[PDB]
Design a protein around this ligand. Structure first.
Ligand SMILES: Nc1nc2c(ncn2[C@@H]2O[C@H](COP(=O)(O)OP(=O)(O)OP(=O)(O)O)[C@@H](O)[C@H]2O)c(=O)[nH]1
Ligand SMILES: Nc1nc2c(ncn2[C@@H]2O[C@H](COP(=O)(O)OP(=O)(O)OP(=O)(O)O)[C@@H](O)[C@H]2O)c(=O)[nH]1
Ligand SMILES: Nc1nc2c(ncn2[C@@H]2O[C@H](COP(=O)(O)OP(=O)(O)OP(=O)(O)O)[C@@H](O)[C@H]2O)c(=O)[nH]1
Ligand SMILES: Nc1ncnc2c1ncn2[C@@H]1O[C@H](COP(=O)(O)OP(=O)(O)OP(=O)(O)O)[C@@H](O)[C@H]1O
Ligand SMILES: Nc1ncnc2c1ncn2[C@@H]1O[C@H](COP(=O)(O)OP(=O)(O)OP(=O)(O)O)[C@@H](O)[C@H]1O
Ligand SMILES: Nc1ncnc2c1ncn2[C@@H]1O[C@H](COP(=O)(O)OP(=O)(O)OP(=O)(O)O)[C@@H](O)[C@H]1O
Ligand SMILES: Nc1ccn([C@@H]2O[C@H](COP(=O)(O)OP(=O)(O)OP(=O)(O)O)[C@@H](O)[C@H]2O)c(=O)n1
Ligand SMILES: Nc1ccn([C@@H]2O[C@H](COP(=O)(O)OP(=O)(O)OP(=O)(O)O)[C@@H](O)[C@H]2O)c(=O)n1
Ligand SMILES: Nc1ccn([C@@H]2O[C@H](COP(=O)(O)OP(=O)(O)OP(=O)(O)O)[C@@H](O)[C@H]2O)c(=O)n1
Ligand SMILES: Nc1ccn([C@@H]2O[C@H](COP(=O)(O)OP(=O)(O)OP(=O)(O)O)[C@@H](O)[C@H]2O)c(=O)n1
Ligand SMILES: [Cl-]
Ligand SMILES: [Cl-]
Ligand SMILES: [Cl-]
Ligand SMILES: [Mg+2]
Ligand SMILES: [Mg+2]
Ligand SMILES: [Mg+2]
Ligand SMILES: [Mg+2]
Lengths: 247, 247, 62, 247
């Protein structure tokens, strides 16, 4: 046989490159996943991730309360935190024993898979009582925020998209939903009558994951990296695996 | 009057047969329910059922964590079980005090009502971090598993469909979503423009039920049987009520 | 060892100690107890008996 | 065939009688069990049974403390009861908050199986510090109490032997060991050199049982009766199953 790495008959090499390219491109086919992640960062360094993975479209929607830090199996000031919520829902509405709940997110990062079409991204960033823009009557139910998404790149390939906003002020008390649609460069509408029931089934088949990791280090090591997910850390370092035409 | 059970003028008998046939056939009309049940069996003999009942289509989606046994009002090693989850999400990722959580399901049974079309059944059986097939990039978001569904029969009538798989190995750690579409032998597409908003409303109107029963006996006696639901027990015994052309 | 002594006991952790009294009553006589579980996960799933190579196997009794 | 219950060819009847006679006589063979039960009766009506079943010989030995009522999974005044014990071991030796512990047995019944030889029965009924007769130096380590054992009879057959003594006074604070030897009408000594190691093995093979039942009713119903054990209740009623030459 020919010697490795020296000729056009390195079939092991050709197959390796195809294996990777096939994965990149499968993800972008209409048969592929589109995935969204919401990372809620807490002052103690821990991070709640909520991930949803589905065909065609995908999204996450959380209440103010659901985005607050919850330490499984530990004390959470659960009564005081009911009282905190009452004062967040209406000023001077509760009887809490703290000015600022350290369970409130300090920041949110939203990441989409590279199979999303960024122009389809929509965000409903509501107030603490789940209203998008001050009052329902004048609320558009979303903002199209794709222009703000940065490309997470590795080796020159787009491995994901990130929108990050800090919530560092006392008044940054939010509810949050986000949504993106899978790339579809074709003129086959996946929600036209021929395939619409499959999109309805995709709503039932969407897989959800949620967990609080103790530190960004741990998220990078045990959540992002093992699963070949895209990420951007606090030091603006990009994580992910470039696959297209790559060995 | 004619004597009962002796002539074609037993109207009480005719009405009884129609009453039953009407129910079988109503369920199969597009006005009818389609229902799915996920049974998660635990080593202590208890069983979590999640049921969803809706028009047109129906499905259930649960995280790894949500399928774990939770004993309401009793101790659940809640801190250790956070640690268990960390080691299930990534090997050697947690600091638990047990090798195997007895809260992990030992088996799953998926049952559909007889109004499902088995060829529409789709399952997303993911890993513990809610990925269908090892990595998102190469994951088809579902498998069409209808061929594996057994018919639950009573008196010769199909009263439901069952797919059962055990999770007896240490590595059987799953997330799970399943979906089926209601029978529609017509060429009226329920999700075409004339009726699509009704299917969107059906997503909001789907009724959910979940509860942990202490034993299969108790599930059969107090969940399955009172509600005329189909079931298949560990001894391969079929439960349900035959209705078509029956008194 | 008794039935009870072979059951799992987690030193320094919770063991459903009251419910497990009730489990034992139903194991000693069917329908004899008032437990909140069908199967106690504290029951052994298997037993291995090992002897040293200095045993005479023909003397083994169980 | 001959008609049942009318002739000497009722083989079903002959076999039934042999089946029963074989059990009575097997128990009395040297291959058979000898069994002892100690019942400790508490003021709340509950009863601790300790049973031991072995070949050749059998016995039970318990400390003062081990004979005290212990309610599994409930509160037992465990600290105060340490203090009670200190005052029982030496007068005015402890700092308890009660004059009389209701955990002290009110009575003891000792029962042997009908395979015991009553003349071999020996009892060490010690004081609270496990001394048989006031001081070790002058203590015989047992008393041969067989003469006091009453026969528990059913249908004229000896189904067991009972010695019962109440402990109704404040000073009845005891330690207790009892022992009996299996019938051996032969001149083959089971502890002579030919079989002595088998008796040593019988010491390891003796099976023990202990449990606190809530009432004498419950002991009769769920302990004594299901297992064909002999008993004598507070109303002097005999329980057991006659087997010799019986259908
Ligand atoms: N400035 C301000 N914003 C409020 C207040 N209450 C709610 N908000 C919301 O805060 C959102 C903007 O959040 P931020 O960007 O963290 O506040 P900012 O004033 O821009 O401060 P910087 O981002 O740090 O420059 C707006 O969309 C408002 O709807 C308030 O009392 N003052
Ligand atoms: N065999 C194996 N399967 C794994 C492992 N990790 C995850 N799995 C998943 O296990 C799934 C199959 O589960 P099982 O059917 O219970 O395993 P099995 O090897 O077929 O064992 P049996 O079903 O009892 O014959 C596969 O789809 C794998 O994706 C692993 O380390 N070994
Ligand atoms: N009488 C008496 N017996 C004691 C005392 N201390 C220990 N004992 C033991 O109590 C045992 C006898 O118990 P009982 O039969 O309940 O006492 P009793 O005086 O015979 O009273 P009755 O049996 O009700 O007639 C004796 O063997 C003594 O060793 C004590 O202070 N007085
Ligand atoms: N919508 C898209 N989805 C996936 N890949 C894309 C998309 N658009 C361009 N690419 C490819 O991704 C790689 C990077 O292109 P891109 O335009 O992001 O890089 P750039 O010009 O260096 O940076 P930027 O546009 O962010 O300033 C190229 O191979 C490009 O063909
Ligand atoms: N998709 C269906 N939905 C409901 N009923 C059906 C369907 N297909 C067939 N039936 C009816 O159900 C009854 C049983 O038919 P079926 O083919 O399941 O039984 P079978 O041939 O004895 O068993 P099997 O096909 O499982 O080997 C018949 O009345 C049949 O007409
Ligand atoms: N040591 C023994 N073991 C077993 N059975 C015996 C023993 N001695 C006698 N028996 C038998 O038990 C039955 C009852 O005999 P037993 O002498 O106990 O009754 P009794 O004379 O009516 O009453 P008691 O001797 O208690 O005043 C008879 O069949 C007798 O042969
Ligand atoms: N504004 C507040 C806050 C707390 N408490 C009291 O604080 C007690 C315990 O604190 P809690 O808020 O419940 O937190 P933890 O018990 O410490 O932690 P967790 O409840 O999450 O286990 C509660 O009984 C509650 O009555 C109160 O009276 N008023
Ligand atoms: N790997 C572990 C597991 C448990 N614990 C400690 O175990 C204590 C109590 O056990 P827990 O896991 O919380 O279970 P339970 O309290 O018995 O039951 P539950 O919390 O569900 O009421 C907790 O305070 C926790 O700190 C720990 O330190 N490390
Ligand atoms: N069949 C049962 C089982 C439990 N309980 C109640 O459950 C409470 C606490 O559960 P327990 O069985 O005692 O287990 P744990 O306290 O969680 O753990 P452990 O007692 O071993 O520390 C007890 O007070 C008991 O009264 C009950 O009433 N009936
Ligand atoms: N003579 C005594 C008796 C009891 N106590 C105190 O009583 C408290 C609780 O009573 P306890 O004797 O321990 O019984 P319970 O806790 O009610 O039941 P248990 O310990 O068996 O669970 C203990 O902390 C112990 O310090 C004491 O100081 N002095
Ligand atoms: Cl495609
Ligand atoms: Cl219809
Ligand atoms: Cl013999
Ligand atoms: Mg706890
Ligand atoms: Mg609290
Ligand atoms: Mg307890
Ligand atoms: Mg105590």
């Amino acid at each position: 046989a020919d010697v490795a790495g020296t000729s056009n008959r390195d079939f092991r090499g050709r197959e390796q490159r195809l294996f990777n390219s096939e994965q990149y491109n499968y993800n972008n086919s209409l048969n592929g996943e589109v995935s969204v992640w919401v990372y809620a960062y807490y002052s103690d360094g821990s991070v709640l991730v909520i991930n949803k993975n589905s065909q065609y479209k995908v999204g996450i929607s959380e209440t103010f309360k659901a985005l607050k830090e919850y330490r499984k199996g530990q004390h959470n000031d659960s009564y005081d935190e009911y009282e905190v919520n009452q004062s967040i829902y209406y000023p001077n509405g509760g009887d809490a024993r703290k000015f600022h709940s350290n369970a409130k997110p300090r920041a949110i990062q939203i990441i989409f898979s590279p199979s999303v079409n960024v122009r389809t991204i929509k965000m409903a960033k509501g107030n603490a009582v789940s209203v998008p823009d001050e009052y329902l009557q004048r609320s558009h139910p979303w903002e199209a925020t794709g222009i703000k998404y940065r490309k997470i790149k590795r080796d020159g390939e787009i491995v994901g998209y990130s929108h990050y906003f800090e919530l560092p002020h006392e008044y940054n008390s939010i509810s949050l939903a986000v949504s993106g649609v899978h790339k579809n460069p074709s003129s086959y509408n996946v929600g036209s009558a021929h395939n619409v029931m499959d999109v309805f089934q995709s709503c039932d088949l969407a897989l959800r994951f949620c967990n609080r990791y103790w530190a960004e280090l741990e998220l990078v090591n045990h959540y992002i990296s093992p699963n070949a997910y895209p990420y951007l850390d606090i030091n603006n370092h990009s994580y992910g695996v470039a696959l297209s035409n790559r060995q």
